[PDB]
Design a binder for this molecule. Structure first.
Ligand SMILES: OC[C@H]1O[C@H](OC[C@H]2O[C@H](O)[C@@H](O)[C@@H](O)[C@@H]2O)[C@@H](O)[C@@H](O)[C@@H]1O
Length: 336
């Protein structure tokens, strides 16, 4: 499949098998930022689940453990001293998924201990009536990029453990986020600041983790309002975070946002599968399938001769240095 081709090319260009980490770009000079590396860990998992090539499937399963080992070799196993609660939570969520795939208890301990550190100590009701702080070093802002991933991590921990504590946490976090970090109609705000108030700037990755948490809560609770919340956020994405031709925006130059389509596509795939299975929202489901397919074909059409796709899916084929986070989005799109 094209998903196999894309993942193999991505590894050929960006994987460092000695450091067991991805390079930040094709010059192979610095390795990827820690939080982004968790998202590339999840890409490896998603390709592992997608492929049928037995040589590839075996390699990807090995790579799931290697990415963790390379990251712990550089950063250590205990992430509770990292001042960024989002970095901690992205790794907690990745570790929960790694537990589901491998059954290795080290991943359950990594997921649960880091989720518990953030939720138990960084959830606060003094500001904004709830929500998790972005940082643990300073308490100034509460952000979509910690809160919705935390709800996702809690849902994975609920599935793993069957402990209602994690469903209760997911529900509490999501409901707060819907109230304080969205417009009620699917637009996810970046954050709320103590000194400046709301910052209602929407981006791909925050639409994505909101959609993923909403789909997961729908499945865990049976409450279809959560599926509606996901549909409204997908409609917002398709109507407002695209160029004049309907292709998902390129969000650079901000380095965190450049590859955000990766997280968005991962979560849109969850919504797509749930709509296909339930037969709910059939008019939107057909429009959504068509728009996703269009976007994926545009992305793949933008590949270079090495089968790598830069994050500016709509643009001219460039030469020179490619970046692993920007380039991950197409790989993700083809492994959904
Ligand atoms: O358009 C949303 C924001 O996009 C950029 O910030 C990216 C991320 O930076 C930090 O990791 C956190 O503040 C995250 O919440 C944020 O998404 C900047 O352009 C910012 O000014 C925009 O508000």
């Amino acid at each position: 499949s094209d998903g196999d081709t894309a993942m193999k090319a991505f590894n050929d260009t960006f994987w460092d098998p000695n450091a067991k980490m991805f390079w930040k770009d094709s010059k192979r000079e610095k390795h990827q930022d820690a939080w982004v590396e968790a998202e590339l860990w999840e890409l490896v998992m998603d390709a592992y689940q997608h492929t049928s090539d037995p040589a590839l499937k075996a390699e990807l399963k090995t790579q799931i453990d290697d990415v963790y080992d390379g990251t712990v070799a550089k950063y250590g196993q205990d992430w509770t001293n990292n001042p960024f609660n989002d970095d901690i939570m992205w790794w907690a969520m990745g570790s929960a998924r790694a537990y589901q795939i491998t059954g290795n208890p080290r991943y359950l301990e990594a997921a649960r201990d880091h989720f518990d550190f953030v939720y138990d100590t960084q959830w606060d009701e003094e500001f904004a009536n709830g929500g998790i702080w972005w940082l643990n070093s300073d308490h100034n802002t509460k952000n979509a990029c910690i809160n919705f991933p935390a709800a996702q991590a809690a849902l994975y921990l609920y599935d793993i453990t069957k402990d209602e504590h994690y469903l209760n946490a997911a529900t509490k976090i999501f409901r707060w986020g819907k109230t304080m970090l969205t417009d009620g109609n699917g637009k996810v705000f970046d954050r709320i600041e103590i000194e400046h108030g709301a910052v209602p700037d929407a981006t791909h990755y925050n639409q994505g983790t909101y959609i993923g948490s909403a789909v997961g809560l729908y499945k865990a609770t049976g409450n279809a309002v959560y599926l509606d919340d996901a549909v409204k956020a997908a409609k917002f994405t398709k109507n407002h975070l695209v160029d004049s031709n309907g292709v998902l925006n390129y969000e650079g130059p901000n380095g965190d946002l450049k590859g955000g389509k990766t997280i968005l596509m991962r979560n849109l795939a969850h919504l797509q599968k749930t709509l296909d299975e339930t037969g709910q929202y059939p008019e939107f489901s057909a429009e959504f399938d068509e728009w996703l397919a269009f976007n994926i074909e545009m992305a793949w059409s933008h590949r270079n001769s090495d089968h790598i796709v830069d994050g500016n899916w709509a643009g001219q084929l460039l030469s020179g240095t490619y970046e692993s986070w920007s380039s991950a989005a197409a790989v993700q799109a083809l492994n959904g």
